[PDB]
Amino acid sequence: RWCVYAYVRIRGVLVRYRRCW
Amino acid sequence: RWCVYAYVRIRGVLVRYRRCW
């Protein structure tokens, strides 16, 4: 399977993005 | 495929990552 994992963290925030097909 | 994109930053160094299998 194909998936995608993203993780953003700056200042004091954390935006963990994701996705799958 | 496996995509990966993150953007973590601390102190004064931004660790960015980008790549897809």
Side-chain angles (χ1 to χ4, degrees), chain A:
Chain A
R1 283 37 176 178
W2 330 135
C3 276
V4 330
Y5 270 139
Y7 179 110
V8 192
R9 157 172 121 154
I10 332 175
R11 273 109 158 174
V13 179
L14 176 32
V15 206
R16 286 191 62 271
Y17 210 86
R18 37 189 284 167
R19 208 270 228 82
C20 286
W21 273 290

